[PDB]
Write a protein that binds this ligand. Structure first.
Ligand SMILES: CC1(C)Nc2nc(N)[nH]c(=O)c2N=C1O
Ligand SMILES: CC1(C)Nc2nc(N)[nH]c(=O)c2N=C1O
Lengths: 160, 160
């Protein structure tokens, strides 16, 4: 059984509701247990600025699903939740991304684990640090170092 | 002519020389003029940590080549300079990326301009800021703001 980290984001059609629905669906996956979820953070858009602010979170799961089966399931959840994206780098009702799959490094046709650009994203690293305070990444970097860059972030920690 | 910015990176086979050879090739392109280049910066790898530190720079050119014709020329330079890349996110002799092409937003199968993840890389924004401190990005963000996040960077600015 492996510990995986999933990043969630949305800025369209009631973002908080989209995240709650996605978390419920993830929690119901066969051979998967949702361990904990970070707080929801309202963040400034990365991309064109003429779009709504995003609501972001990171969920921790324990699963027996292989990397590609977990991907299939996350894509199924996005599809059944009616995922819509209005433009590249723009508005989307929901995005589910596998940040980490154990300590494995998977870089193939369908997967990029880890995806290092995501470690430069405040709305990914701050929530991850909240639920995995002493995490050491597959490339040997430590979460406490990575979060330094975002110490002065202006994200709003929502409730609920 | 259009003012374009090109990011340069290398961590193999004498990075400093790979960058000098690339800059020379760029300066020699038809309908193109190399205006200035930033200093070269030695930075920690973004990705696996078992690879050498990278040497990075950003160049400002004025060109009449279309976005795709510029891309073809940059890829031809990479090929003619024997570009080698071991694995995804790994070591490479040279990478030339079009960061900005005027104030245009080009998002197709071959181009991603701007590429917002690059705005999160200390090794692109610090040297970009060095040569264009008044830059206003296509999404209207101002470089003076984007660079604040990298104020405490540990990159080594090299001589000359
Ligand atoms: C377009 C892009 C990069 N911008 C984002 N911006 C923010 N703040 N949060 C996101 O989840 C997010 N996701 C995306 O997919
Ligand atoms: C693999 C990746 C993202 N890592 C890098 N890391 C650094 N520091 N500099 C780069 O130019 C660079 N280029 C790449 O292509």
């Amino acid at each position: 059984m492996i510990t995986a980290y999933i990043a969630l984001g949305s800025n369209l059609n009631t973002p908080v509701e989209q995240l709650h629905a996605a978390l419920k669906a993830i929690s119901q996956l066969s051979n998967t247990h949702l361990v904990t979820t970070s707080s929801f953070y309202k963040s400034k858009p990365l991309g064109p600025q003429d779009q709504p602010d995003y609501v972001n979170a990171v969920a921790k799961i324990e699963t027996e699903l292989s990397p590609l089966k977990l991907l299939d399931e996350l894509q199924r959840i996005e599809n059944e939740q009616g995922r819509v994206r209005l433009r590249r780098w723009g508005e989307r009702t929901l995005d589910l991304d596998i940040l980490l799959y154990g300590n494995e490094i998977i870089q193939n046709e369908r997967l990029t684990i880890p995806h290092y650009d995501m470690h430069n994203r405040e709305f990914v690293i701050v929530p991850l640090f909240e639920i995995a305070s002493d995490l050491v990444l597959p490339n040997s970097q430590i979460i406490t170092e990575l979060v330094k860059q975002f110490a002065d972030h202006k994200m709003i920690k929502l409730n609920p």
